[PDB]
Every structure is written in structure tokens, then in C-alpha cells.
PDB file of C-alpha atoms (C1' of nucleotides) and ligand atoms in Angstrom:
ATOM      1  CA  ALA C   1      -0.030   0.220   0.048  1.00 25.19           C
ATOM      2  CA  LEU C   2       1.243   3.391   1.135  1.00 28.14           C
ATOM      3  CA  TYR C   3       3.639   4.832   3.650  1.00 26.17           C
ATOM      4  CA  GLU C   4       3.039   7.243   6.364  1.00 26.92           C
ATOM      5  CA  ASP C   5       6.617   7.961   7.800  1.00 23.96           C
ATOM      6  CA  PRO C   6       6.015   8.903  11.598  1.00 25.50           C
ATOM      7  CA  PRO C   7       6.502  12.226  13.443  1.00 27.85           C
ATOM      8  CA  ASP C   8       9.832  12.994  14.442  1.00 27.53           C
ATOM      9  CA  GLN C   9      11.342  11.616  17.697  1.00 28.14           C
ATOM     10  CA  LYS C  10      13.697  14.246  18.314  1.00 30.03           C
ATOM     11  CA  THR C  11      14.927  12.780  21.653  1.00 30.18           C
ATOM     12  CA  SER C  12      17.605  10.543  22.473  1.00 31.42           C
ATOM     13  CA  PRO C  13      17.145   7.084  23.858  1.00 30.33           C
ATOM     14  CA  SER C  14      18.775   8.863  26.899  1.00 30.36           C
ATOM     15  CA  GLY C  15      16.646  11.860  26.871  1.00 33.40           C
ATOM     16  CA  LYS C  16      19.224  14.296  25.317  1.00 35.01           C
ATOM     17  CA  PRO C  17      17.850  16.054  22.563  1.00 36.58           C
ATOM     18  CA  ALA C  18      18.971  15.907  18.899  1.00 39.65           C
ATOM     19  CA  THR C  19      21.735  18.305  18.173  1.00 40.56           C
ATOM     20  CA  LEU C  20      22.880  17.139  14.657  1.00 39.63           C
ATOM     21  CA  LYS C  21      20.332  16.854  11.524  1.00 42.36           C
ATOM     22  CA  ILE C  22      22.412  15.083   8.226  1.00 45.14           C
ATOM     23  CA  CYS C  23      20.068  15.003   5.390  1.00 43.61           C
ATOM     24  CA  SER C  24      20.511  12.732   2.171  1.00 42.91           C
ATOM     25  CA  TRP C  25      19.181  12.857  -1.135  1.00 44.68           C
ATOM     26  CA  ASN C  26      19.829  11.263  -4.570  1.00 45.04           C
ATOM     27  CA  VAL C  27      19.301  14.136  -6.447  1.00 41.73           C
ATOM     28  CA  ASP C  28      19.432  12.534 -10.126  1.00 41.31           C
ATOM     29  CA  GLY C  29      20.541  15.558 -12.081  1.00 40.85           C
ATOM     30  CA  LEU C  30      21.398  18.556  -9.667  1.00 42.24           C
ATOM     31  CA  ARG C  31      20.401  21.121 -12.109  1.00 43.01           C
ATOM     32  CA  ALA C  32      17.121  19.487 -12.841  1.00 43.07           C
ATOM     33  CA  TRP C  33      16.632  19.057  -9.246  1.00 45.42           C
ATOM     34  CA  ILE C  34      17.044  22.744  -8.516  1.00 46.40           C
ATOM     35  CA  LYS C  35      14.696  23.862 -11.412  1.00 47.13           C
ATOM     36  CA  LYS C  36      12.094  21.222 -10.014  1.00 47.78           C
ATOM     37  CA  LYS C  37      12.497  23.278  -6.613  1.00 47.86           C
ATOM     38  CA  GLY C  38      14.491  20.831  -4.506  1.00 49.65           C
ATOM     39  CA  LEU C  39      16.282  23.446  -2.666  1.00 50.20           C
ATOM     40  CA  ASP C  40      13.356  24.908  -1.525  1.00 50.12           C
ATOM     41  CA  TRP C  41      12.572  21.956   0.268  1.00 48.84           C
ATOM     42  CA  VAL C  42      16.060  21.831   1.649  1.00 45.17           C
ATOM     43  CA  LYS C  43      15.695  25.379   2.997  1.00 41.56           C
ATOM     44  CA  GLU C  44      12.381  24.183   4.711  1.00 43.97           C
ATOM     45  CA  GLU C  45      14.058  21.494   6.257  1.00 44.42           C
ATOM     46  CA  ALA C  46      17.037  23.279   7.294  1.00 45.18           C
ATOM     47  CA  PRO C  47      19.616  20.410   7.949  1.00 44.41           C
ATOM     48  CA  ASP C  48      22.728  20.758   9.497  1.00 44.01           C
ATOM     49  CA  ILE C  49      24.428  18.741   6.667  1.00 44.35           C
ATOM     50  CA  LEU C  50      23.136  17.897   3.204  1.00 43.99           C
ATOM     51  CA  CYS C  51      24.597  15.016   1.014  1.00 40.87           C
ATOM     52  CA  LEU C  52      23.321  14.615  -2.361  1.00 43.82           C
ATOM     53  CA  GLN C  53      24.036  11.670  -5.167  1.00 46.30           C
ATOM     54  CA  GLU C  54      23.482  11.821  -8.760  1.00 45.54           C
ATOM     55  CA  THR C  55      24.480  15.048  -9.276  1.00 48.63           C
ATOM     56  CA  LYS C  56      25.390  14.756 -12.838  1.00 48.03           C
ATOM     57  CA  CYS C  57      27.126  18.059 -13.226  1.00 47.24           C
ATOM     58  CA  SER C  58      30.673  19.363 -13.129  1.00 48.35           C
ATOM     59  CA  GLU C  59      32.349  21.506 -10.967  1.00 48.53           C
ATOM     60  CA  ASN C  60      32.140  24.800 -13.145  1.00 47.87           C
ATOM     61  CA  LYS C  61      28.923  23.940 -14.318  1.00 51.24           C
ATOM     62  CA  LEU C  62      27.449  24.129 -10.705  1.00 47.51           C
ATOM     63  CA  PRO C  63      24.492  26.324 -10.467  1.00 46.27           C
ATOM     64  CA  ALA C  64      24.503  29.793  -8.905  1.00 44.42           C
ATOM     65  CA  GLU C  65      21.750  29.054  -6.749  1.00 44.63           C
ATOM     66  CA  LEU C  66      23.751  27.004  -3.649  1.00 44.60           C
ATOM     67  CA  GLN C  67      25.979  30.060  -3.385  1.00 46.94           C
ATOM     68  CA  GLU C  68      23.535  31.921  -1.778  1.00 47.82           C
ATOM     69  CA  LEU C  69      22.344  28.673  -0.004  1.00 46.13           C
ATOM     70  CA  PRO C  70      22.923  29.343   3.941  1.00 44.42           C
ATOM     71  CA  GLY C  71      23.713  27.248   6.743  1.00 46.39           C
ATOM     72  CA  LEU C  72      25.519  25.068   4.323  1.00 45.76           C
ATOM     73  CA  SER C  73      28.442  27.066   3.783  1.00 49.28           C
ATOM     74  CA  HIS C  74      31.061  24.491   3.583  1.00 51.72           C
ATOM     75  CA  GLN C  75      30.505  22.643   0.034  1.00 51.13           C
ATOM     76  CA  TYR C  76      32.563  19.858  -1.342  1.00 50.44           C
ATOM     77  CA  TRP C  77      31.825  17.909  -4.855  1.00 50.30           C
ATOM     78  CA  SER C  78      33.292  14.960  -6.588  1.00 50.53           C
ATOM     79  CA  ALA C  79      32.758  14.057 -10.061  1.00 48.74           C
ATOM     80  CA  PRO C  80      34.364  11.329 -12.213  1.00 49.35           C
ATOM     81  CA  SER C  81      37.625  11.542 -13.679  1.00 50.80           C
ATOM     82  CA  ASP C  82      36.842  11.778 -17.311  1.00 48.35           C
ATOM     83  CA  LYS C  83      32.857  11.029 -17.698  1.00 48.51           C
ATOM     84  CA  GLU C  84      30.681  14.241 -18.020  1.00 49.45           C
ATOM     85  CA  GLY C  85      27.183  14.292 -17.153  1.00 46.55           C
ATOM     86  CA  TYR C  86      27.547  11.149 -14.980  1.00 46.40           C
ATOM     87  CA  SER C  87      27.491  10.374 -11.375  1.00 42.91           C
ATOM     88  CA  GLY C  88      28.786  12.656  -8.921  1.00 44.57           C
ATOM     89  CA  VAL C  89      28.054  13.781  -5.065  1.00 39.33           C
ATOM     90  CA  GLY C  90      28.273  16.569  -2.919  1.00 38.59           C
ATOM     91  CA  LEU C  91      28.155  17.478   0.581  1.00 37.83           C
ATOM     92  CA  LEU C  92      27.202  20.618   2.198  1.00 37.99           C
ATOM     93  CA  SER C  93      27.831  21.466   6.101  1.00 36.09           C
ATOM     94  CA  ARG C  94      26.730  24.528   8.409  1.00 36.00           C
ATOM     95  CA  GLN C  95      29.788  23.507  10.248  1.00 35.98           C
ATOM     96  CA  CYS C  96      33.560  23.418   8.600  1.00 36.23           C
ATOM     97  CA  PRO C  97      34.857  19.782   8.627  1.00 35.04           C
ATOM     98  CA  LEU C  98      37.919  18.707  10.165  1.00 36.62           C
ATOM     99  CA  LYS C  99      39.371  17.095   6.930  1.00 35.62           C
ATOM    100  CA  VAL C 100      37.583  16.235   3.627  1.00 35.30           C
ATOM    101  CA  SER C 101      38.805  13.370   1.513  1.00 32.72           C
ATOM    102  CA  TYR C 102      37.641  12.033  -1.717  1.00 31.62           C
ATOM    103  CA  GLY C 103      37.158   8.605  -3.215  1.00 31.12           C
ATOM    104  CA  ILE C 104      38.043   5.276  -0.997  1.00 32.41           C
ATOM    105  CA  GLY C 105      41.697   4.805  -1.743  1.00 32.45           C
ATOM    106  CA  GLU C 106      41.763   2.830  -4.367  1.00 30.18           C
ATOM    107  CA  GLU C 107      42.410   3.671  -8.171  1.00 35.78           C
ATOM    108  CA  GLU C 108      39.972   1.289  -9.646  1.00 38.14           C
ATOM    109  CA  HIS C 109      37.041   2.873  -7.224  1.00 38.40           C
ATOM    110  CA  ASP C 110      38.069   6.306  -7.561  1.00 34.32           C
ATOM    111  CA  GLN C 111      37.561   7.452 -10.796  1.00 35.41           C
ATOM    112  CA  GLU C 112      33.543   8.161 -10.774  1.00 35.55           C
ATOM    113  CA  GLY C 113      33.054  10.583  -8.302  1.00 35.62           C
ATOM    114  CA  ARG C 114      31.060   8.609  -6.010  1.00 33.07           C
ATOM    115  CA  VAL C 115      32.632   8.924  -2.407  1.00 30.42           C
ATOM    116  CA  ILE C 116      33.193  12.115  -0.123  1.00 30.28           C
ATOM    117  CA  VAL C 117      34.629  11.531   3.356  1.00 29.67           C
ATOM    118  CA  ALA C 118      34.234  14.063   6.023  1.00 34.11           C
ATOM    119  CA  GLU C 119      35.524  14.172   9.590  1.00 33.80           C
ATOM    120  CA  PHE C 120      33.870  16.063  12.195  1.00 36.73           C
ATOM    121  CA  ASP C 121      34.708  16.436  15.699  1.00 35.16           C
ATOM    122  CA  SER C 122      33.446  13.130  17.282  1.00 31.74           C
ATOM    123  CA  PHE C 123      32.135  11.417  14.176  1.00 33.74           C
ATOM    124  CA  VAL C 124      33.048  10.745  10.517  1.00 30.64           C
ATOM    125  CA  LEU C 125      30.394  10.960   7.941  1.00 30.08           C
ATOM    126  CA  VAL C 126      30.565   9.157   4.157  1.00 29.19           C
ATOM    127  CA  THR C 127      28.064  10.028   1.347  1.00 29.51           C
ATOM    128  CA  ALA C 128      28.730   7.584  -1.796  1.00 27.91           C
ATOM    129  CA  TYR C 129      26.558   6.876  -4.532  1.00 28.94           C
ATOM    130  CA  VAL C 130      27.188   3.047  -5.114  1.00 27.60           C
ATOM    131  CA  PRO C 131      27.547   1.772  -8.587  1.00 25.26           C
ATOM    132  CA  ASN C 132      24.542   0.385 -10.407  1.00 27.70           C
ATOM    133  CA  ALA C 133      25.246  -3.162 -11.184  1.00 27.72           C
ATOM    134  CA  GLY C 134      23.676  -2.457 -14.391  1.00 29.40           C
ATOM    135  CA  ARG C 135      20.931  -3.651 -16.408  1.00 29.99           C
ATOM    136  CA  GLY C 136      21.238  -6.696 -17.352  1.00 32.17           C
ATOM    137  CA  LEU C 137      23.773  -6.983 -14.745  1.00 33.00           C
ATOM    138  CA  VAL C 138      26.466  -6.146 -17.048  1.00 30.90           C
ATOM    139  CA  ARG C 139      28.344  -4.548 -14.508  1.00 30.91           C
ATOM    140  CA  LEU C 140      27.620  -6.964 -11.779  1.00 34.04           C
ATOM    141  CA  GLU C 141      30.945  -8.380 -11.912  1.00 33.72           C
ATOM    142  CA  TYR C 142      32.489  -5.129 -10.988  1.00 32.36           C
ATOM    143  CA  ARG C 143      30.250  -4.108  -8.037  1.00 31.79           C
ATOM    144  CA  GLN C 144      31.334  -7.134  -6.196  1.00 30.68           C
ATOM    145  CA  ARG C 145      34.763  -5.838  -6.105  1.00 29.20           C
ATOM    146  CA  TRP C 146      33.540  -2.130  -5.262  1.00 29.32           C
ATOM    147  CA  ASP C 147      31.465  -3.604  -2.237  1.00 28.71           C
ATOM    148  CA  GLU C 148      34.628  -5.420  -0.868  1.00 29.24           C
ATOM    149  CA  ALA C 149      36.487  -2.445  -1.072  1.00 29.18           C
ATOM    150  CA  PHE C 150      34.332  -0.228   0.219  1.00 28.03           C
ATOM    151  CA  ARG C 151      34.076  -2.591   3.139  1.00 32.49           C
ATOM    152  CA  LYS C 152      37.647  -2.890   3.740  1.00 34.10           C
ATOM    153  CA  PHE C 153      37.761   0.832   3.762  1.00 30.89           C
ATOM    154  CA  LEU C 154      34.841   1.493   5.758  1.00 32.51           C
ATOM    155  CA  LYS C 155      35.988  -0.803   8.217  1.00 31.29           C
ATOM    156  CA  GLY C 156      39.187   0.785   8.483  1.00 34.83           C
ATOM    157  CA  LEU C 157      37.637   4.032   8.946  1.00 33.55           C
ATOM    158  CA  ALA C 158      35.241   3.136  11.799  1.00 38.35           C
ATOM    159  CA  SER C 159      38.298   1.586  13.360  1.00 36.68           C
ATOM    160  CA  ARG C 160      39.637   5.394  14.478  1.00 36.75           C
ATOM    161  CA  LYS C 161      36.179   7.098  14.632  1.00 37.15           C
ATOM    162  CA  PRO C 162      32.564   6.207  14.859  1.00 38.00           C
ATOM    163  CA  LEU C 163      31.140   6.592  11.595  1.00 38.36           C
ATOM    164  CA  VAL C 164      27.615   7.506   9.909  1.00 37.34           C
ATOM    165  CA  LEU C 165      27.498   6.237   6.133  1.00 34.91           C
ATOM    166  CA  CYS C 166      24.710   7.915   3.982  1.00 33.91           C
ATOM    167  CA  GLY C 167      23.913   8.136   0.522  1.00 33.52           C
ATOM    168  CA  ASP C 168      22.597   5.805  -2.204  1.00 33.04           C
ATOM    169  CA  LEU C 169      23.736   2.373  -1.765  1.00 34.96           C
ATOM    170  CA  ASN C 170      22.242   0.574  -4.666  1.00 33.80           C
ATOM    171  CA  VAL C 171      21.039  -2.631  -2.566  1.00 33.09           C
ATOM    172  CA  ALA C 172      17.667  -3.546  -1.569  1.00 34.10           C
ATOM    173  CA  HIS C 173      18.737  -5.259   1.592  1.00 34.67           C
ATOM    174  CA  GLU C 174      15.515  -7.738   2.177  1.00 32.96           C
ATOM    175  CA  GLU C 175      12.383  -8.504   0.907  1.00 30.01           C
ATOM    176  CA  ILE C 176      10.645  -5.675   2.799  1.00 28.65           C
ATOM    177  CA  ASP C 177      12.670  -2.978   1.275  1.00 27.40           C
ATOM    178  CA  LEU C 178      11.326  -3.687  -2.220  1.00 26.96           C
ATOM    179  CA  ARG C 179       7.736  -3.614  -3.495  1.00 23.53           C
ATOM    180  CA  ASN C 180       8.283  -6.402  -5.769  1.00 20.01           C
ATOM    181  CA  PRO C 181      10.947  -8.944  -4.387  1.00 20.55           C
ATOM    182  CA  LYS C 182      10.101 -11.849  -6.407  1.00 23.12           C
ATOM    183  CA  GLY C 183      10.202 -10.143  -9.671  1.00 23.56           C
ATOM    184  CA  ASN C 184      13.628  -8.668  -9.320  1.00 25.24           C
ATOM    185  CA  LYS C 185      15.510 -11.509  -7.861  1.00 24.70           C
ATOM    186  CA  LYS C 186      18.072 -10.882 -10.749  1.00 24.46           C
ATOM    187  CA  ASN C 187      17.455  -7.679 -11.461  1.00 25.91           C
ATOM    188  CA  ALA C 188      20.038  -5.104 -10.364  1.00 23.89           C
ATOM    189  CA  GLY C 189      19.676  -3.871  -6.858  1.00 22.91           C
ATOM    190  CA  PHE C 190      18.245  -7.271  -5.347  1.00 23.69           C
ATOM    191  CA  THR C 191      20.577 -10.000  -6.792  1.00 25.93           C
ATOM    192  CA  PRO C 192      21.480 -12.503  -4.222  1.00 28.10           C
ATOM    193  CA  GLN C 193      25.024 -10.910  -4.763  1.00 25.67           C
ATOM    194  CA  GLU C 194      24.104  -7.258  -3.669  1.00 27.41           C
ATOM    195  CA  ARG C 195      21.997  -8.374  -0.623  1.00 27.43           C
ATOM    196  CA  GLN C 196      24.917 -10.512   0.316  1.00 27.94           C
ATOM    197  CA  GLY C 197      27.532  -7.739   0.423  1.00 30.69           C
ATOM    198  CA  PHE C 198      25.317  -5.472   2.312  1.00 28.76           C
ATOM    199  CA  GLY C 199      24.727  -8.065   4.934  1.00 27.10           C
ATOM    200  CA  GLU C 200      28.577  -8.395   4.978  1.00 24.04           C
ATOM    201  CA  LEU C 201      29.258  -4.663   5.147  1.00 25.28           C
ATOM    202  CA  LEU C 202      26.827  -4.613   8.262  1.00 22.78           C
ATOM    203  CA  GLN C 203      28.419  -7.432   9.943  1.00 24.15           C
ATOM    204  CA  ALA C 204      32.076  -6.527   8.869  1.00 24.06           C
ATOM    205  CA  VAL C 205      32.688  -2.757   9.963  1.00 23.61           C
ATOM    206  CA  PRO C 206      30.328  -3.236  11.936  1.00 25.93           C
ATOM    207  CA  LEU C 207      27.255  -0.961  11.058  1.00 29.06           C
ATOM    208  CA  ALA C 208      23.452  -0.984  12.096  1.00 31.54           C
ATOM    209  CA  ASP C 209      20.703   0.238   9.746  1.00 33.69           C
ATOM    210  CA  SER C 210      19.148   2.774  11.355  1.00 34.21           C
ATOM    211  CA  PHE C 211      15.796   3.133   9.958  1.00 34.78           C
ATOM    212  CA  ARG C 212      15.458  -0.779  10.237  1.00 35.71           C
ATOM    213  CA  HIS C 213      16.880  -0.402  13.930  1.00 36.79           C
ATOM    214  CA  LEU C 214      13.789   1.495  14.644  1.00 36.03           C
ATOM    215  CA  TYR C 215      11.153  -0.069  12.461  1.00 34.73           C
ATOM    216  CA  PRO C 216      12.420  -3.615  11.812  1.00 33.36           C
ATOM    217  CA  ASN C 217       8.824  -4.665  10.305  1.00 34.62           C
ATOM    218  CA  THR C 218       7.536  -1.376   8.809  1.00 38.39           C
ATOM    219  CA  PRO C 219       6.912  -2.998   5.257  1.00 36.55           C
ATOM    220  CA  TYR C 220       6.084  -0.405   2.005  1.00 33.35           C
ATOM    221  CA  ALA C 221       8.556   2.142   3.286  1.00 32.29           C
ATOM    222  CA  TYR C 222      10.759   3.201   0.183  1.00 30.43           C
ATOM    223  CA  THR C 223      12.983   6.056  -1.008  1.00 29.81           C
ATOM    224  CA  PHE C 224      12.975   5.264  -4.875  1.00 29.88           C
ATOM    225  CA  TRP C 225      10.535   4.577  -7.690  1.00 28.46           C
ATOM    226  CA  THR C 226      11.072   4.838 -11.684  1.00 31.38           C
ATOM    227  CA  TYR C 227       9.501   7.488 -13.267  1.00 32.39           C
ATOM    228  CA  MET C 228       7.983   4.902 -15.446  1.00 32.55           C
ATOM    229  CA  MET C 229       4.950   3.178 -15.503  1.00 30.92           C
ATOM    230  CA  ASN C 230       3.297   5.082 -12.700  1.00 31.61           C
ATOM    231  CA  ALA C 231       5.891   3.531 -10.274  1.00 32.84           C
ATOM    232  CA  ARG C 232       5.629   6.263  -7.338  1.00 35.73           C
ATOM    233  CA  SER C 233       1.991   6.659  -8.006  1.00 34.25           C
ATOM    234  CA  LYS C 234       1.266   3.209  -6.530  1.00 34.04           C
ATOM    235  CA  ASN C 235       4.348   3.299  -4.200  1.00 39.13           C
ATOM    236  CA  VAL C 236       5.913   0.344  -6.396  1.00 40.56           C
ATOM    237  CA  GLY C 237       9.256   1.360  -5.173  1.00 40.86           C
ATOM    238  CA  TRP C 238      12.615   0.316  -3.336  1.00 41.51           C
ATOM    239  CA  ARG C 239      14.415   1.412  -0.269  1.00 40.61           C
ATOM    240  CA  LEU C 240      18.241   2.179  -1.476  1.00 42.60           C
ATOM    241  CA  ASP C 241      19.197   5.178   0.525  1.00 41.07           C
ATOM    242  CA  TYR C 242      20.518   4.366   4.117  1.00 38.43           C
ATOM    243  CA  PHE C 243      21.813   5.781   7.279  1.00 39.48           C
ATOM    244  CA  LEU C 244      24.291   3.215   8.304  1.00 39.90           C
ATOM    245  CA  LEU C 245      25.367   3.715  11.824  1.00 43.18           C
ATOM    246  CA  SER C 246      28.516   2.456  13.878  1.00 43.81           C
ATOM    247  CA  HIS C 247      27.023   0.637  16.843  1.00 45.70           C
ATOM    248  CA  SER C 248      28.726   3.712  18.863  1.00 48.49           C
ATOM    249  CA  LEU C 249      26.142   5.726  17.884  1.00 49.91           C
ATOM    250  CA  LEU C 250      23.388   3.382  18.328  1.00 47.82           C
ATOM    251  CA  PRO C 251      22.310   5.435  21.801  1.00 48.86           C
ATOM    252  CA  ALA C 252      22.600   8.619  20.078  1.00 47.55           C
ATOM    253  CA  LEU C 253      20.186   7.770  17.466  1.00 50.91           C
ATOM    254  CA  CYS C 254      16.839   9.751  17.800  1.00 48.67           C
ATOM    255  CA  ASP C 255      15.028   8.853  14.475  1.00 49.66           C
ATOM    256  CA  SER C 256      15.447   8.121  11.010  1.00 47.09           C
ATOM    257  CA  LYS C 257      13.191   9.324   8.614  1.00 43.78           C
ATOM    258  CA  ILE C 258      11.858   8.984   4.744  1.00 42.45           C
ATOM    259  CA  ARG C 259      10.537  12.133   3.612  1.00 42.91           C
ATOM    260  CA  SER C 260       8.145  10.394   0.958  1.00 41.65           C
ATOM    261  CA  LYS C 261       6.120  13.641   0.108  1.00 42.50           C
ATOM    262  CA  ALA C 262       9.309  15.305  -1.374  1.00 44.30           C
ATOM    263  CA  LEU C 263       9.267  15.591  -5.140  1.00 47.21           C
ATOM    264  CA  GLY C 264      12.167  16.478  -7.392  1.00 47.02           C
ATOM    265  CA  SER C 265      14.069  12.853  -8.379  1.00 46.44           C
ATOM    266  CA  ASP C 266      13.096   9.201  -8.588  1.00 46.26           C
ATOM    267  CA  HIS C 267      14.573   9.049  -4.884  1.00 45.82           C
ATOM    268  CA  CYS C 268      12.947  10.790  -1.982  1.00 50.35           C
ATOM    269  CA  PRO C 269      15.264  12.455   0.580  1.00 52.74           C
ATOM    270  CA  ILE C 270      16.006  10.879   3.834  1.00 49.52           C
ATOM    271  CA  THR C 271      16.766  12.372   7.425  1.00 43.89           C
ATOM    272  CA  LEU C 272      18.943  11.258  10.343  1.00 43.14           C
ATOM    273  CA  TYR C 273      18.330  12.519  13.936  1.00 42.94           C
ATOM    274  CA  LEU C 274      21.251  12.338  16.467  1.00 43.96           C
ATOM    275  CA  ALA C 275      22.377  13.535  19.839  1.00 44.91           C
ATOM    276  CA  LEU C 276      26.144  14.310  19.702  1.00 45.74           C
TER     277      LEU C 276
ATOM    278  C1'  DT T   1       7.022  -1.977 -13.733  1.00 42.39           C
ATOM    279  C1'  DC T   2       4.511  -3.510 -17.691  1.00 40.52           C
ATOM    280  C1'  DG T   3       2.430  -6.413 -20.893  1.00 38.60           C
ATOM    281  C1'  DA T   4       2.893  -9.134 -24.934  1.00 39.99           C
ATOM    282  C1'  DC T   5       4.664 -12.991 -26.323  1.00 41.22           C
ATOM    283  C1'  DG T   6       6.495 -17.833 -25.624  1.00 43.06           C
ATOM    284  C1'  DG T   7       6.260 -23.120 -24.672  1.00 42.59           C
ATOM    285  C1'  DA T   8       4.592 -25.283 -21.353  1.00 44.65           C
ATOM    286  C1'  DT T   9       1.286 -28.219 -18.170  1.00 45.25           C
ATOM    287  C1'  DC T  10      -3.276 -28.595 -16.336  1.00 47.73           C
ATOM    288  C1'  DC T  11      -8.716 -30.344 -15.740  1.00 47.09           C
TER     289       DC T  11
ATOM    290  C1'  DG L   1      21.464  27.650 -30.088  1.00 47.87           C
ATOM    291  C1'  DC L   2      19.354  23.937 -32.134  1.00 48.90           C
ATOM    292  C1'  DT L   3      18.298  19.623 -33.993  1.00 47.84           C
ATOM    293  C1'  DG L   4      19.207  14.640 -33.924  1.00 48.21           C
ATOM    294  C1'  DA L   5      20.804  10.434 -31.433  1.00 47.77           C
ATOM    295  C1'  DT L   6      23.082   7.937 -27.531  1.00 53.05           C
ATOM    296  C1'  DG L   7      24.444   7.149 -22.479  1.00 52.53           C
ATOM    297  C1'  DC L   8      22.680   5.581 -18.022  1.00 51.48           C
ATOM    298  C1'  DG L   9      19.877   4.054 -14.632  1.00 52.97           C
TER     299       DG L   9
ATOM    300  C1'  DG S   1      -8.628 -28.555 -27.357  1.00 56.33           C
ATOM    301  C1'  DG S   2      -9.404 -23.864 -24.367  1.00 56.37           C
ATOM    302  C1'  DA S   3      -8.276 -21.415 -20.215  1.00 56.31           C
ATOM    303  C1'  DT S   4      -4.350 -20.570 -16.634  1.00 52.83           C
ATOM    304  C1'  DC S   5       0.005 -21.450 -14.659  1.00 52.92           C
ATOM    305  C1'  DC S   6       4.929 -19.461 -15.025  1.00 51.52           C
ATOM    306  C1'  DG S   7       9.624 -18.188 -17.452  1.00 49.82           C
ATOM    307  C1'  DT S   8      11.327 -14.281 -20.924  1.00 48.52           C
ATOM    308  C1'  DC S   9      11.837  -9.905 -22.964  1.00 49.62           C
ATOM    309  C1'  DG S  10      10.168  -5.786 -25.552  1.00 47.87           C
ATOM    310  C1'  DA S  11       9.134   0.095 -24.846  1.00 46.55           C
ATOM    311  C1'  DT S  12       7.748   3.629 -20.779  1.00 47.54           C
ATOM    312  C1'  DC S  13      10.146   8.357 -18.091  1.00 46.65           C
ATOM    313  C1'  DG S  14      13.743  11.201 -16.918  1.00 45.67           C
ATOM    314  C1'  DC S  15      18.537  13.559 -16.718  1.00 43.26           C
ATOM    315  C1'  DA S  16      22.321  14.535 -19.062  1.00 37.29           C
ATOM    316  C1'  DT S  17      26.121  13.635 -22.995  1.00 37.50           C
ATOM    317  C1'  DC S  18      27.667  13.931 -28.112  1.00 36.94           C
ATOM    318  C1'  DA S  19      28.038  14.995 -33.245  1.00 35.22           C
ATOM    319  C1'  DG S  20      27.415  18.488 -36.161  1.00 32.41           C
ATOM    320  C1'  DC S  21      26.523  23.346 -37.793  1.00 30.78           C
TER     321       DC S  21
HETATM  322 CA1  LIG N   1      25.037   1.850 -21.549  1.00 34.15          CA
END
DNA sequence: TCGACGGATCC
DNA sequence: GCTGATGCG
DNA sequence: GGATCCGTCGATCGCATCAGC
């Protein structure tokens, strides 16, 4: 059926109020997103950090609009080495980061403008747009190598600070994260492989799926629908966009939300509340 | 995601 | 700037 | 032999490039 995201639990497990609001969103064309009034929604939601994926836009072609955009003064972008109009991500922050890193530190996996690291005082934040296993699973082979590297770099990372990873992970973890599971079991995004990966990643690093940590059994809660075949109309979507918390931060987690009613892409923005 | 094709297999 | 076509997802 | 089963396998909607002029 349809999903109604619950109201915002702005208090910790321990009564301490939320201090830190990170928002994440696969934009799918940053210029079209802004033309489609997405930045309005950003302004009204007033996050402390905004992460975007699928920006499909190069550094200089970046629009003027997000220059004026206040409260998200520090802005960082990666966009692929040699392929224009493709991929790209960006991280905007109200407060200034301690240190910003691009890519995951392997050549093979750092050429498509997918990953921004940003270390803050008490945590480190990664935003990524995981590569699609490709239609016809033509790039499935690659993405098993991506996953294994993303893992071993995310594990190294968490070893030092506690981390929040957000972004589009291109994996529909379980059959509850998919409107049509059985008609998708070797479509990309729900292969035995990619769900296998997600599982390794949660057990490897380790990381909790914050949405499923608070709503382990809510169905029909989705983050993406194809513009085709009326997919968002019937909410026949997926859950592709996660907030993957280190276990240290589980006592800081106040809520984890999915802002379905927010138009402008084929994805909807998600939103994390922590007490930090 | 959807519907058209298949080629089966069923009462 | 404009038309076509192709890429990606 | 006709009506239902379940595996394929074809155009859709959107964003952005590219070639060419
Ligand atoms: Ca292609």
C-alpha cells in the first residue's frame, strides 16, 4: 500500500535532544533537481548537513543558486575523472569539517566521483552513490569488487572514529525493502550478490541499518521509484538510501526518517537525527 | 514495472 | 542555440 | 482443445551527453 513516515522523535534513547541533523538525497540531476524546486525543500528542512548523490554536473557548471544557500556554507564535490554528466556527489555543511577526503583510496574505485569522506569532531561521515550493477547485470562483476573494497575501507575508517555512512547504496537489503521482490531476484539491486554484500558490510565494520533498527517490521517504506509505469503513484518502489550507523552511535540515534512527500527526483530525501 | 509473447502443463 | 542521437539508470 | 499456470523480453520516463553546424 502506502507509507506514512511517523513524526520526528527528536530525543535520544537517553532523553538528550537531537543536536545534529544530516539529510541525504539522490538528486538525479542537480540542475533539474533545483529547477524542480528541490532547494526550497532543503531550506525548509534546514538540515545541519546535506548530502547529494547523482548530481550529474561538473564543478564549474554548478548552479549559482547554492552559492547563496545559507547554513550549508562549506561545500564539497566529486565528479568523475573523465565522464561528464555522470554520477557525482556533494556534501554541504553548516559547520566546517575537520578534514575532507575524496574516494575510498583505491584507483579502480575512485574514478566515478562517488565518495566524499568528512571527519567532524566526534564522528566521520561518508556519502556515496554506489555503482549500479547495471541493467542486464552487465556491471554486476565490477560491483562485487566495489563492495569488498568499500567494506575494507569503511572498516578501517570506523576503527578510528565512529562513522555515519549515508547515500545511495543501490542495494535492496531484504524483501521488505522492495515492493516486488520475487519479480526482481536477478534484476540489479536485488541480486543474491548485492544483498549478500550489504549483509557482509553490516557484520563486517560493523554497522546498523538505522531505519530498520527503529522500524524492523514496517513494510512499504521506500526511497526510490522509477519515473516509468506510474511507479511512485502506486508506491511500487525500493529502499536504496540508507543511514548506516556504527554501533557506538546507536545510543545517539533519535530517529531516522524517509521524506516521501518530497518531489524532484526518482528518490526521496532521507533524514537522520542524532544526539552528539 | 508492464504487458506482450512464448512454451509449456493443467482439468 | 538548435536538431538529432546515444548513455545511464 | 481451451483456459491458466510461470519463465522471458520487448518500450515507458526522466536527466544528461555527444556529433555536427
Ligand atoms: Ca549503456
